């Protein structure tokens, strides 16, 4: 009611309107500055 | 800073908004958190004087040293854009210039000389060195002054730079001469073999690099004249003939395994 | 992107019926007779085979 849709669960299980959502996250190593470099490394809790 | 727990680090919860203890869960601190101006042009005419001039304008004092650094950075950007350098080398050049300018030892030389010297240092330190003549082409400064300034920068700022090898210039020379990948590999192999086998005592790496270019050029369908080699390398045609006539014996040994002669 | 394994509505297998359907289009048959030669009686499976795009053939052109 009021502009809504009943959907077939079995159809959706069979691939009806199934889709994927790619998101991309971008990061660069901006070593500009005197000593403000950010090298790509696994950060352990000892340093950092 | 957790009570009842001396020497306890607090996990900062940027989602829950608290500072939380990994032994008992108390919270210290109720919540977590997280120079100049320009005077523009007047809109209304009520700010204009009888002679105009709007009576309100930017004084732009900003010290002398900051003005000098700004002009130097402008010169560095417009110099590095001419040979199309990536901005990492530009930022490294700015870093070296700021360290030199705050070192306070090179006031007696033109800022443009320190600028081009820092450009040469930054080009050296990224493993993609340019020749002195290439910097001199895009700079208003002679090779003598840039050499002396480079000598004073290395003496004063106390750093070490890697010695140039021939293989660094090979890709730029071949690509700017529009030569394919096989010519690149053959010329690089020729240059490195001529360096290691010792045919060229004390010869400049730029001369033997252009000699390896002439090697790879005068063996295939495409051929490059001495004048073009001197145009792209900056070494004189006499220096190319000197390197030619001194590298010409033992030619097949310098070549790689396959080249399609 | 590729032919579905099952019809969304009923559940009849239509994954194996794509290639042969294309063969029946290569054998100068009409699409209705090509569907009727496969046993796709209900119009849901006729919707499946008749209105499908083989975009995977487009994707295969690019290098892996
Ligand atoms: Zn605690
Ligand atoms: Zn069906």
Coordinates of C-alpha atoms and ligand atoms in Angstrom, one line a residue:
Chain A
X1 CA 0.0 0.0 0.0
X2 CA 1.0 3.6 -0.7
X3 CA 3.5 3.0 -3.5
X4 CA 5.2 -0.1 -2.2
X5 CA 6.3 -3.4 -3.7
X6 CA 5.8 -7.0 -2.6
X7 CA 8.7 -9.1 -3.9
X8 CA 9.2 -12.8 -4.4
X9 CA 11.7 -14.2 -1.9
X10 CA 12.4 -17.3 -4.0
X11 CA 13.1 -15.2 -7.1
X12 CA 15.5 -13.0 -5.1
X13 CA 17.2 -16.2 -4.0
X14 CA 17.5 -17.2 -7.6
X15 CA 19.3 -14.0 -8.6
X16 CA 16.5 -11.4 -9.1
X17 CA 17.9 -7.9 -9.0
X18 CA 21.0 -9.1 -7.1
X19 CA 23.9 -6.7 -7.5
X20 CA 27.3 -5.5 -6.1
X21 CA 28.5 -2.2 -4.9
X22 CA 32.2 -1.4 -5.5
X23 CA 33.7 1.3 -3.4
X24 CA 37.3 2.5 -3.8
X25 CA 39.4 4.2 -1.2
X26 CA 42.4 6.2 -2.4
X27 CA 45.5 7.1 -0.2
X28 CA 48.9 8.6 -1.2
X29 CA 52.2 8.9 0.6
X30 CA 52.6 12.7 0.9
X31 CA 56.2 12.9 2.0
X32 CA 56.2 16.7 1.6
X33 CA 57.7 18.5 4.5
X34 CA 61.0 18.4 6.5
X35 CA 60.5 15.0 8.3
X36 CA 56.7 14.4 7.9
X37 CA 56.9 11.2 5.9
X38 CA 54.3 8.4 6.2
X39 CA 55.8 5.2 4.9
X40 CA 53.4 2.3 4.2
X41 CA 54.1 -0.3 6.9
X42 CA 52.1 -2.5 9.3
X43 CA 51.7 -0.3 12.4
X44 CA 52.6 -2.2 15.5
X45 CA 51.6 -1.0 19.0
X46 CA 55.3 -0.6 20.1
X47 CA 55.9 2.5 18.0
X48 CA 53.2 4.6 16.4
Chain B
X1 CA 45.0 7.9 33.7
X2 CA 42.4 5.5 34.9
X3 CA 41.7 5.6 38.7
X4 CA 42.4 2.3 40.6
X5 CA 44.7 1.4 37.7
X6 CA 48.1 3.2 37.6
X7 CA 50.0 3.1 34.4
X8 CA 47.1 2.1 32.2
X9 CA 46.7 3.2 28.5
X10 CA 43.2 4.3 27.5
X11 CA 41.6 2.9 24.3
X12 CA 40.1 6.0 22.6
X13 CA 36.8 5.0 21.1
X14 CA 36.1 7.4 18.2
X15 CA 32.8 5.5 17.6
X16 CA 31.4 5.4 21.1
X17 CA 32.9 8.7 22.0
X18 CA 34.8 7.8 25.2
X19 CA 38.2 7.1 26.7
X20 CA 37.9 3.5 28.0
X21 CA 40.2 1.2 30.3
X22 CA 41.1 -2.3 29.3
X23 CA 41.0 -3.7 32.8
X24 CA 37.7 -2.3 34.3
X25 CA 36.0 -0.1 31.8
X26 CA 35.9 3.2 33.7
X27 CA 35.7 6.5 31.7
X28 CA 38.1 9.4 32.3
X29 CA 36.7 12.5 30.7
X30 CA 33.0 12.6 29.9
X31 CA 33.3 13.1 26.1
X32 CA 35.9 13.1 23.4
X33 CA 36.5 15.9 21.0
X34 CA 37.0 15.8 17.1
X35 CA 48.7 34.8 10.0
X36 CA 47.3 37.5 7.7
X37 CA 44.3 38.7 5.6
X38 CA 43.9 40.4 2.2
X39 CA 41.7 43.5 1.6
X40 CA 39.9 43.0 -1.7
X41 CA 38.3 45.4 -4.2
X42 CA 35.3 47.4 -3.0
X43 CA 31.8 46.5 -4.1
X44 CA 30.1 49.8 -3.3
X45 CA 31.4 53.1 -4.5
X46 CA 31.1 54.6 -1.0
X47 CA 34.7 53.5 -0.3
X48 CA 36.2 55.4 -3.2
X49 CA 38.0 58.7 -2.5
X50 CA 37.7 61.8 -4.6
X51 CA 40.7 60.5 -6.6
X52 CA 39.5 56.9 -6.5
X53 CA 42.0 54.4 -5.2
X54 CA 39.3 53.0 -2.8
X55 CA 41.4 54.0 0.3
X56 CA 41.5 50.4 1.6
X57 CA 44.2 48.1 0.3
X58 CA 46.4 45.2 1.4
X59 CA 49.8 46.3 2.9
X60 CA 51.4 42.8 2.1
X61 CA 54.5 43.2 4.5
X62 CA 54.9 39.5 5.4
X63 CA 58.6 40.0 6.4
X64 CA 61.6 39.9 3.9
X65 CA 62.6 36.3 4.4
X66 CA 59.1 34.9 3.7
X67 CA 59.0 37.0 0.5
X68 CA 62.4 35.6 -0.5
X69 CA 61.2 32.0 0.1
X70 CA 58.0 32.6 -1.8
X71 CA 59.9 34.0 -4.8
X72 CA 62.3 31.1 -4.6
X73 CA 59.5 28.6 -4.6
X74 CA 57.9 30.3 -7.6
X75 CA 61.2 30.1 -9.4
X76 CA 61.6 26.4 -8.5
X77 CA 58.1 25.6 -9.8
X78 CA 58.5 27.4 -13.0
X79 CA 61.9 25.9 -13.5
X80 CA 60.9 22.3 -12.8
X81 CA 57.8 22.6 -15.0
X82 CA 60.0 23.3 -18.0
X83 CA 61.6 19.8 -18.0
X84 CA 58.4 18.3 -16.6
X85 CA 59.5 17.1 -13.2
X86 CA 57.1 15.3 -10.9
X87 CA 56.0 17.3 -7.8
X88 CA 57.8 15.0 -5.4
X89 CA 61.1 16.4 -6.7
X90 CA 59.7 19.9 -6.4
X91 CA 58.7 19.4 -2.8
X92 CA 62.1 17.8 -2.0
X93 CA 63.8 20.9 -3.6
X94 CA 61.7 23.1 -1.4
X95 CA 62.7 21.1 1.7
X96 CA 66.4 21.5 0.8
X97 CA 66.0 25.2 0.1
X98 CA 64.3 25.8 3.4
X99 CA 67.0 23.9 5.3
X100 CA 69.7 25.8 3.4
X101 CA 68.0 29.2 3.9
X102 CA 67.6 28.4 7.7
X103 CA 71.2 27.1 7.9
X104 CA 72.3 30.7 7.2
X105 CA 75.6 30.1 5.3
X106 CA 74.9 31.0 1.7
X107 CA 73.7 34.7 1.8
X108 CA 76.7 35.8 -0.4
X109 CA 75.2 33.9 -3.5
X110 CA 72.1 34.6 -5.6
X111 CA 69.0 32.8 -4.3
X112 CA 68.4 31.5 -7.9
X113 CA 71.8 29.7 -7.6
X114 CA 70.8 28.0 -4.4
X115 CA 67.5 27.2 -6.0
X116 CA 68.9 25.4 -9.0
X117 CA 71.5 23.7 -6.8
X118 CA 68.7 22.3 -4.6
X119 CA 66.9 21.2 -7.8
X120 CA 70.1 19.3 -8.8
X121 CA 70.3 17.8 -5.3
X122 CA 66.7 16.7 -5.3
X123 CA 67.1 15.2 -8.8
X124 CA 70.1 13.3 -7.6
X125 CA 68.5 12.0 -4.4
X126 CA 65.5 10.4 -6.2
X127 CA 67.7 8.2 -8.4
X128 CA 66.7 10.1 -11.5
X129 CA 69.6 12.6 -11.9
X130 CA 69.7 15.3 -14.6
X131 CA 72.9 16.6 -16.1
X132 CA 74.2 20.1 -15.1
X133 CA 73.6 21.3 -18.7
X134 CA 69.9 20.3 -18.5
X135 CA 69.5 22.4 -15.3
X136 CA 71.5 25.2 -17.0
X137 CA 69.1 25.1 -20.0
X138 CA 66.1 25.9 -17.8
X139 CA 68.0 28.3 -15.5
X140 CA 69.4 31.8 -16.0
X141 CA 72.7 30.8 -14.4
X142 CA 76.0 29.6 -15.9
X143 CA 77.4 26.1 -15.3
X144 CA 80.4 27.5 -13.2
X145 CA 78.1 29.2 -10.7
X146 CA 75.8 26.1 -10.4
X147 CA 78.9 23.9 -9.9
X148 CA 80.4 26.1 -7.2
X149 CA 77.0 26.4 -5.5
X150 CA 76.5 22.6 -5.6
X151 CA 80.0 22.3 -4.1
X152 CA 79.1 24.7 -1.3
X153 CA 75.7 23.0 -0.6
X154 CA 77.4 19.6 -0.2
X155 CA 80.1 21.2 2.0
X156 CA 77.7 23.1 4.2
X157 CA 74.5 21.1 4.7
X158 CA 76.5 18.0 5.4
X159 CA 74.9 15.3 3.2
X160 CA 76.2 12.6 0.9
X161 CA 74.9 12.0 -2.6
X162 CA 75.3 8.9 -4.7
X163 CA 77.8 8.9 -7.6
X164 CA 76.1 9.0 -10.9
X165 CA 76.2 5.9 -13.2
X166 CA 75.6 5.8 -16.9
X167 CA 72.4 3.7 -16.7
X168 CA 70.3 6.5 -15.1
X169 CA 70.5 8.7 -18.2
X170 CA 69.8 6.0 -20.8
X171 CA 66.1 5.9 -20.6
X172 CA 65.6 9.6 -20.9
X173 CA 68.1 9.9 -23.8
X174 CA 66.5 7.0 -25.8
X175 CA 62.9 8.0 -25.1
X176 CA 63.5 11.7 -26.0
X177 CA 65.4 10.4 -29.1
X178 CA 62.3 8.2 -29.7
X179 CA 64.1 4.8 -29.7
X180 CA 62.4 1.5 -29.0
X181 CA 62.9 -0.8 -26.0
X182 CA 65.5 -3.1 -27.6
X183 CA 67.7 -0.1 -28.4
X184 CA 67.3 0.9 -24.7
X185 CA 68.4 -2.5 -23.4
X186 CA 71.3 -2.8 -25.9
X187 CA 72.6 0.7 -25.1
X188 CA 72.3 0.2 -21.3
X189 CA 74.2 -3.1 -21.6
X190 CA 76.9 -1.5 -23.7
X191 CA 77.3 1.4 -21.2
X192 CA 77.5 -0.9 -18.2
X193 CA 79.9 -3.3 -19.9
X194 CA 82.1 -0.4 -21.0
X195 CA 82.1 1.0 -17.4
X196 CA 82.9 -2.4 -15.8
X197 CA 85.5 -3.7 -18.3
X198 CA 87.6 -0.5 -18.0
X199 CA 88.0 1.0 -21.5
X200 CA 87.3 4.5 -20.2
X201 CA 89.6 5.6 -17.3
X202 CA 88.4 9.0 -16.0
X203 CA 86.0 9.7 -18.9
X204 CA 82.7 11.5 -17.9
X205 CA 79.7 9.1 -17.7
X206 CA 77.7 11.5 -19.9
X207 CA 80.2 11.0 -22.8
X208 CA 80.2 7.2 -22.6
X209 CA 76.4 7.2 -22.2
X210 CA 76.0 9.2 -25.5
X211 CA 78.6 6.8 -27.0
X212 CA 76.4 3.9 -26.1
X213 CA 73.5 5.8 -27.7
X214 CA 75.5 6.1 -30.8
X215 CA 76.4 2.3 -30.6
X216 CA 72.7 1.3 -30.4
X217 CA 71.7 3.9 -33.1
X218 CA 74.3 2.9 -35.7
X219 CA 73.3 -0.7 -35.8
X220 CA 69.6 -0.8 -36.7
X221 CA 67.2 0.6 -39.2
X222 CA 66.9 4.0 -37.5
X223 CA 70.1 6.1 -37.4
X224 CA 71.0 9.2 -35.5
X225 CA 73.5 11.9 -36.5
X226 CA 76.3 13.2 -34.3
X227 CA 74.6 16.6 -34.1
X228 CA 71.3 15.0 -32.8
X229 CA 73.3 13.1 -30.1
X230 CA 75.0 16.3 -29.0
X231 CA 71.7 18.1 -29.0
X232 CA 70.1 15.5 -26.7
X233 CA 73.1 14.9 -24.5
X234 CA 74.8 18.3 -24.4
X235 CA 78.3 16.8 -25.0
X236 CA 80.1 18.2 -28.0
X237 CA 80.6 16.2 -31.3
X238 CA 84.4 16.0 -30.7
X239 CA 83.7 14.3 -27.3
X240 CA 81.4 11.8 -29.2
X241 CA 84.2 11.1 -31.7
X242 CA 86.7 10.7 -28.9
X243 CA 84.5 8.1 -27.2
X244 CA 83.7 6.5 -30.6
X245 CA 87.3 6.0 -31.6
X246 CA 88.2 4.8 -28.1
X247 CA 85.2 2.3 -27.7
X248 CA 85.3 0.9 -31.3
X249 CA 87.7 -2.0 -30.6
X250 CA 86.1 -5.0 -28.9
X251 CA 82.6 -4.2 -30.2
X252 CA 80.7 -7.6 -30.2
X253 CA 81.7 -8.2 -26.6
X254 CA 79.9 -5.1 -25.5
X255 CA 76.7 -6.0 -27.3
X256 CA 74.0 -8.2 -25.6
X257 CA 73.2 -11.8 -26.5
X258 CA 70.7 -11.0 -29.3
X259 CA 70.0 -7.7 -31.0
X260 CA 69.1 -8.5 -34.6
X261 CA 72.1 -6.7 -36.2
Chain C
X1 CA 26.2 -10.4 -17.5
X2 CA 25.7 -14.1 -18.2
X3 CA 22.6 -16.3 -18.6
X4 CA 21.1 -17.2 -15.2
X5 CA 21.2 -20.8 -14.1
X6 CA 17.5 -20.8 -13.1
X7 CA 14.5 -18.8 -14.2
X8 CA 13.7 -16.2 -11.5
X9 CA 9.9 -16.9 -11.5
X10 CA 9.4 -20.6 -11.7
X11 CA 12.8 -22.2 -11.2
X12 CA 13.3 -24.1 -14.5
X13 CA 16.9 -24.6 -15.5
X14 CA 17.8 -22.2 -18.3
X15 CA 21.5 -22.0 -17.9
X16 CA 22.1 -24.9 -20.3
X17 CA 19.7 -23.5 -22.9
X18 CA 21.5 -20.4 -24.0
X19 CA 24.1 -21.7 -26.4
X20 CA 21.7 -24.0 -28.2
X21 CA 19.3 -21.1 -28.5
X22 CA 22.0 -19.1 -30.2
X23 CA 22.5 -22.1 -32.5
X24 CA 18.9 -22.0 -33.4
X25 CA 19.3 -18.4 -34.3
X26 CA 22.3 -19.4 -36.4
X27 CA 20.1 -22.0 -38.1
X28 CA 17.7 -19.3 -39.4
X29 CA 14.8 -20.1 -37.1
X30 CA 12.5 -17.5 -35.6
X31 CA 12.9 -16.7 -31.9
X32 CA 9.4 -18.1 -31.0
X33 CA 10.1 -21.4 -32.7
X34 CA 13.6 -21.5 -31.1
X35 CA 12.0 -21.1 -27.7
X36 CA 9.4 -23.8 -28.5
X37 CA 12.1 -26.2 -29.6
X38 CA 13.5 -26.0 -26.0
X39 CA 10.4 -26.7 -24.1
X40 CA 10.1 -23.3 -22.6
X41 CA 6.3 -23.3 -22.4
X42 CA 5.7 -20.8 -19.7
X43 CA 6.5 -17.2 -20.7
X44 CA 8.8 -16.7 -17.7
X45 CA 11.5 -18.8 -19.3
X46 CA 10.7 -17.3 -22.7
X47 CA 11.4 -14.0 -21.0
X48 CA 14.7 -15.4 -19.7
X49 CA 16.0 -16.6 -23.1
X50 CA 14.4 -13.9 -25.3
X51 CA 15.5 -10.9 -23.3
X52 CA 19.1 -11.7 -22.3
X53 CA 22.3 -9.9 -23.1
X54 CA 25.6 -11.8 -23.4
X55 CA 27.8 -9.1 -21.8
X56 CA 30.3 -11.7 -20.7
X57 CA 31.3 -12.0 -24.3
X58 CA 32.0 -8.3 -24.3
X59 CA 34.0 -8.6 -21.0
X60 CA 36.1 -11.4 -22.5
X61 CA 37.6 -9.1 -25.1
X62 CA 39.8 -7.3 -22.5
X63 CA 43.1 -8.8 -21.4
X64 CA 42.9 -10.8 -18.1
Ligands
LIG1 ZN1 40.8 0.9 34.9
LIG2 ZN1 10.5 -19.9 -15.9

